């Protein structure tokens, strides 16, 4: 169903390298509808909440430090298989091995600084969406382009 | 001084035609720093507040109706002469006469549906900025690219 | 009214320099609806018909020779003030003085080889449209994006 | 040999979403020479002819309905291994799984509405070319850029 | 005549902001032929030689300091009225007032840091060309695209 | 380590088809720092030196002939895993099979004329770098964007 939403965050390096317009534009071209969008500086607890899955790991500290070291542009897109696609569009973990055409393959070069975040599954998606956005901030009446779906 | 901020809003047609990424990207290229960003559906009073200057006019009703007829992506950019430039980048009132290269000249075709809004002066800028964004939502520590200014 | 159509032809140099996709795309972005499109090699009489206005001139011969020296991609776009805009988008006669952002200013460099043709007035438009296209070849039910016009 | 031609059609959604210029431009960049180009609304029999291979299938009806539900921009490109490449450029059947960089991966999101058609083999290519274009409509003297081939 | 050459230098900010590919590409699109290209860090005397015209001025010191504060990508393009056009493409002195579409209007924001240099006249052009490049470094057999000139 | 450099050369067809700006720009986006850049016409011995690895082969003659048949824009980029990435960005040997998004997949169509050269390994990289550039021509103080690496 085309009511699937995912959560993506242009991390501090993406924002600070001026990649915001490029990234949103890529998903708008693909056809996905922007449902929520806000630039914010993540707070310690939000970051720790977001990188929960790694809190038992050594490199969790970094995660959190960075994500809160500067503004992040958070957004939620909706469309058929959006969670799946978005990842495809974003690339692999290591920017260097991400293929040309993908967000990280085109602009990425490190793994720590890999510009963007995308929920890895529909489950992490709904956890992430609700975690960063208040229901108030999300669109309801989406209504996607009718030339997009059969 | 490069602490000048302006207010721009991608109106409903711009957002609905997928022009969001293009527009933000244009200002990021130019060098301006994104200080505030949020997609929202304007409310009657906010719209009436925003199109105040025309409330005594007949065509004020339209203004308000439209601006609230769909999501709008509001944003505030900061940089040297940002208010002046942004307008230059956006084009004239009539999209048709806006020159190629400008936002409205490239994508615009009507005047009513002219994709974007930009504060017309630094005064309307500060009124508009504070009107659409809560201080909480705006960056403080801007820190612009050092290759931008002498 | 937004039922105005104009006639544009990517001349042989434009086609041969691979400018076809760029040009059509520019008008599609602007919002104009493609009503007729066909690649053809103009014939002597069609060319002489098209450059009629100059048949009494010395440099009419050239005009005709060139326009028929290779394939030309002819097309008709429709939209509010399309005839006016299209010219604005295309640039001036001398490519060199056409401004950056315009078709000829971006890719043009000579005046003889100035990539594209655009009807100069709505009158020459209807003469040109009917001259290059058979009514069969033109769309009827245009139906332009509703986010384009108020 | 570089006299290989393929047939591609920007279906109704591609045309109606303004993807025409983008698509032609992509093949012009790659180096392929545009041999035939025309926008037309396919007719029932032409569509049924084109989707012949599926006439015994249930979902043949859809195929035909759609392809004729709006204008289609048909074109024929020629170049070394054009049939093979074009497909590579266009993407897989499911837009969602088409990779970033490909036509369907960049702009596609459904499978039914997958923007473009490309002959699947050189055989279907020649059947498709001759089916949509009259020999009159196709270039003869192609003459491709000499910096393209050894 | 189309044997006119001009001299352009992407100053340190342009190079350091990653504008090199964009700028060269813009002139290649326009049709001009790249005759000389080299990245170098200007030396005091070369810079003082280049900003000679201002040596009697107070702000000559800055000029020189900057131009040598980092690598510069120097290049010479040739084409009909190249000196005139290039300037048109580059924009005015103040990036902020340069129009959208122009190099400085699109990416520029200060006047001191205005990304690029272009000879202001054909005279300063030949002085600048010979000053930064050794004849060895410049192409001789230019041979421009035949679809560029009548 | 991010002090890895590779050597790339836009061969004669790439340069002559106006692909120079596009290619440099792609690597600048990815984040790599331009360390050396110069347009030159390779000489017989330099070409024979460069295509040494094939001198015992029949098709070595071609290699050499071509590479010296016109100007080549040589350059050296530096960054984390630059040698690996650059190849990924450039594509496979056969342009036709290179994937969309890659340099050769987007603009390439033959194998002989495949636009660009990239050192195939870090070893061939250092041999190639030193072979085409004099140490004088290469940057020392690279200093890459701090938003690129962790």
From Swiss-Prot, chains A, B, C, D, E, F:
Residues involved in ATP binding: 11, 59, 87, 93, 104, 114
Alphabetical keyword list: ATP-binding, Cytoplasm, Kinase, Magnesium, Metal-binding, Nucleotide metabolism, Nucleotide-binding, Phosphoprotein, Transferase
Transmembrane segments: none
Assembly information from the UniProt record: Homohexamer.
Name of the molecule in the record: Nucleoside diphosphate kinase, cytosolic
GO molecular function, one term: metal ion binding
Entry-linked CDD domains: NDPk_I
Catalysed reaction equations from the record: a 2'-deoxyribonucleoside 5'-diphosphate + ATP = a 2'-deoxyribonucleoside 5'-triphosphate + ADP; a ribonucleoside 5'-diphosphate + ATP = a ribonucleoside 5'-triphosphate + ADP
Biological function: Major role in the synthesis of nucleoside triphosphates other than ATP.
Family the UniProt entry places it in: Belongs to the NDK family.
Pfam families, sorted: NDK
The protein's Enzyme Commission number: 2.7.4.6
SUPFAM superfamilies registered for this protein in UniProt: Nucleoside diphosphate kinase, NDK
Single biological process term from Gene Ontology: response to bacterium
Gene Ontology cellular-component terms listed: cytoplasm; cytoskeleton; phagocytic vesicle; plasma membrane; ribosome; secretory granule
Annotated organism of origin: Dictyostelium discoideum
PANTHER family noted in UniProt: NUCLEOSIDE DIPHOSPHATE KINASE
Location in the cell: Cytoplasm
Class of the enzyme per the UniProt entry, highest EC level: transferase
PROSITE patterns named among the record's database cross-references: NDPK (PS00469), NDPK_LIKE (PS51374)
Primary location group: cytoplasm
Record: active site: 117
UniProt cofactor(s): Mg(2+)
């Amino acid at each position: 169903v085309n009511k699937e939403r995912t959560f993506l965050a242009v991390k501090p390096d993406g924002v600070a390298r001026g990649l915001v317009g490029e990234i949103i534009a890529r998903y708008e071209k693909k056809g996905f509808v922007l449902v929520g969008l806000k630039q914010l500086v993540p707070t310690k607890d939000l970051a720790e909440s977001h990188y929960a899955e790694h809190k038992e790991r050594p490199f969790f500290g970094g995660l959190v430090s960075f994500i809160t070291s500067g503004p992040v542009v958070a957004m939620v897109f909706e469309g058929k298989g959006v969670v799946a696609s978005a990842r495809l569009m974003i690339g692999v973990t290591n920017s260097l091995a991400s293929a040309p055409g993908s967000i990280r393959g085109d602009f990425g070069v490190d793994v720590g600084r890999n510009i963007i975040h995308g929920s890895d599954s529909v489950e992490s998606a709904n956890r992430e969406i609700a975690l960063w956005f208040k229901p108030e901030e999300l669109l309801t009446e989406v209504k996607p382009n009718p030339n997009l779906y059969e």
